[PDB]
């Protein structure tokens, strides 16, 4: 088999700015284990209909995973813009693959508030498709240089998510996994 279990049921996830990638090759991709879970709040596929997945042959499988807040999940698709789609994780315009996400205030929300999960708020330019950027350059939001010192018009680029268990339907933590495909083949389901 292909190790979807290690991807989805994984106990910890990355902050969206440092999204994690796993290559998948030389195994059998069993989507029936995903279909059955009606716990997934998102499940869209691009280039292919999600019903035809156990019936297909995939070339360059990757499985990207990270955590964002709910009303940001819509930025996980081709052709979006917003803080996430521009400064954190940017899908290409011809993306072929599946985007799956599910509410997880049960595991990533802590009494009082969980600040481990971060996102980049500023960046001098937009991410390229599938670019990962973990730098902590102070952001020069002003006209005078910063010299690596925080202050007015000099901002730390990464910010924290405030995940209180008491958060709104849209301010809760979501776990996202992005299956990137291509259509020799090393991954095929039943």
């Amino acid at each position, epitope marked *: 088999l292909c190790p979807f279990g290690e991807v989805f049921n994984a106990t910890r996830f990355a902050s969206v700015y440092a999204w994690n990638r796993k290559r998948i090759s030389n195994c059998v991709a069993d989507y029936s284990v995903l279909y059955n879970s009606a716990s997934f709040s998102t499940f869209k596929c*691009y*280039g292919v*209909s*999600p*019903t035809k*997945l156990n019936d297909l042959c995939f070339t360059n499988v990757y499985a990207d995973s990270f955590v964002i807040r709910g009303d940001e999940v819509r930025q996980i698709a*081709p052709g979006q813009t917003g803080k996430i789609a521009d400064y954190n994780y940017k899908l290409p*315009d011809d993306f072929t693959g599946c985007v799956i996400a599910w509410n997880s205030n049960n595991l990533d929300s802590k009494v009082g508030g969980n600040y481990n999960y971060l996102y980049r708020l500023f960046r001098k330019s937009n991410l390229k498709p599938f670019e990962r950027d973990i730098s902590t350059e102070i952001y020069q939001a002003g006209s005078t240089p910063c010299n690596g010192v925080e202050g007015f018009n000099c901002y730390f680029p990464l910010q924290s998510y405030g995940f209180q268990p008491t958060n709104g339907v849209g301010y809760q933590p979501y776990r996202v996994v992005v299956l990137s495909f291509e*259509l020799p083949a090393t991954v095929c389901g039943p």
Partner: antibody
Amino acid sequence: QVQLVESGGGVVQPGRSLRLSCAASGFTFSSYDMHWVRQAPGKGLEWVAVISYDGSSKFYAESVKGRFTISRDNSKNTLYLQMNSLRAEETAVYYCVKDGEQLVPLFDYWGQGTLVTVSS
Amino acid sequence: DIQMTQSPSSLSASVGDRVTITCRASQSISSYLNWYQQKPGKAPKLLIYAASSLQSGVPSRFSGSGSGTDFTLTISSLQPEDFATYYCQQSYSTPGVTFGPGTKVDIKR
């Protein structure tokens, strides 16, 4: 000689449920995803739901997710679409549709549809 | 969310005309684009699939072209039983499938 025949339409009161039905013939119903697409009275077309060739996967347009359940029975060569908690703005003709052998959905054979009128 | 817009929403043509309907997508949908014909009170019937290739039983005076965000449907020589309403449909985002608003072609006089 592909043929689909919808049933179960009519007038339904807002909130209550209604269940639609499609009897299909003229092709191997075994291996062809089936969809429901609806057409508002004086308007255009909106996909509603898809069910795979065996029933393992079901997917909904995000505007009917959690209210409509789609299903099928390959021995009866019939298709079902249970509509719960219907709203007044959902009055339309409902078509069942046979998918067409592509990687993505396409709407190969339609059939004529059943009217659903939601009003108190 | 991916929105399809078609132009023009009205079209009057005579028999023997070159007819052109354009569809436009809010974003690149590659060439996962299908065209339908619907006549009043009937169901929609498939004309073109995957942007460019033709359905079986469809006359060859229909053709569709283009990819990315701009697509065309062409009736190279209009015939009298073609007066109808024509839709396009993107099937890229598949748990989010969307149609055009339609272009009606009527009889010029």
